[PDB]
Amino acid sequence: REQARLLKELADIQQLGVSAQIVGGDIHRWRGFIAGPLGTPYEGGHFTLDIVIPPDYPYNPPKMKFVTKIWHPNISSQTGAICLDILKHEWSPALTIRTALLSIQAMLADPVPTDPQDAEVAKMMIENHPLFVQTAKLWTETFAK
Amino acid sequence: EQARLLKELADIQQGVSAQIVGGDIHRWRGFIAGPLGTPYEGGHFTLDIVIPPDYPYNPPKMKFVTKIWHPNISSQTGAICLDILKHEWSPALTIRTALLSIQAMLADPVPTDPQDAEVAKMMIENHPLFVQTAKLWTETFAK
Fold first, then answer.
1. Which CATH number is associated with domain A1-145?
2. Which of A67, A71, A132, B124 lies in the 20 to 30 Å Cα band around B139?
């Protein structure tokens, strides 16, 4: 019943940007894939996420982090860690892993210096925004391509 | 706040639909087609939608205006009790997804946790009477 939900999520993700695979035969461990949105420094990039689905999913949210190196104020440049409202206080069992991936993809299209996971990336984006964009595009070409 | 509702309303209009009732953008009329292969097939159901001051943090309130015979909807008042509109609400959901969820509930009634005891009793003990009745009410109120 827990497995049935996770399998159908996987199927709908494929039937529908974003995608996902299970890892090592475990339906509680997935890899997410997200395309850099068009008109961002991430355009043309392909970003891999690690997805740990907790035992009491869907009541508890999945844990997601970037595996692919990315330069973004809301993603740790060092560890890939993120802090998304939808994976936190805005989570509900009515949502899906897909809506989380889409929401991460939207976050790539709308960087927020103001409330950041990476201090240094945020610092640069304030001091020198055109450099931030140059860095993000080079990181995309280098690590996501 | 207004911009969120105006965007949701547009997207909905661009199955299920809604429209503003008069001039209050916090009050909508919702519309749901009865699903195929169910007693509600061919029906058009109207809902009342009250969007509270503090939406999207507080869920919409919804009830059926159209009379309907369904164990999870009051036959008398049209009251519903949908998880998505309660403990499963999130600002990341939309009014459209609540409409879609209510539509799903039409395709899959749950007599074992009911909103109408009289309807759930009939569904349990006299299922063909339930289907017959639910279809008669679709024909009477929803067509």
1. 3.10.110.10
2. B124
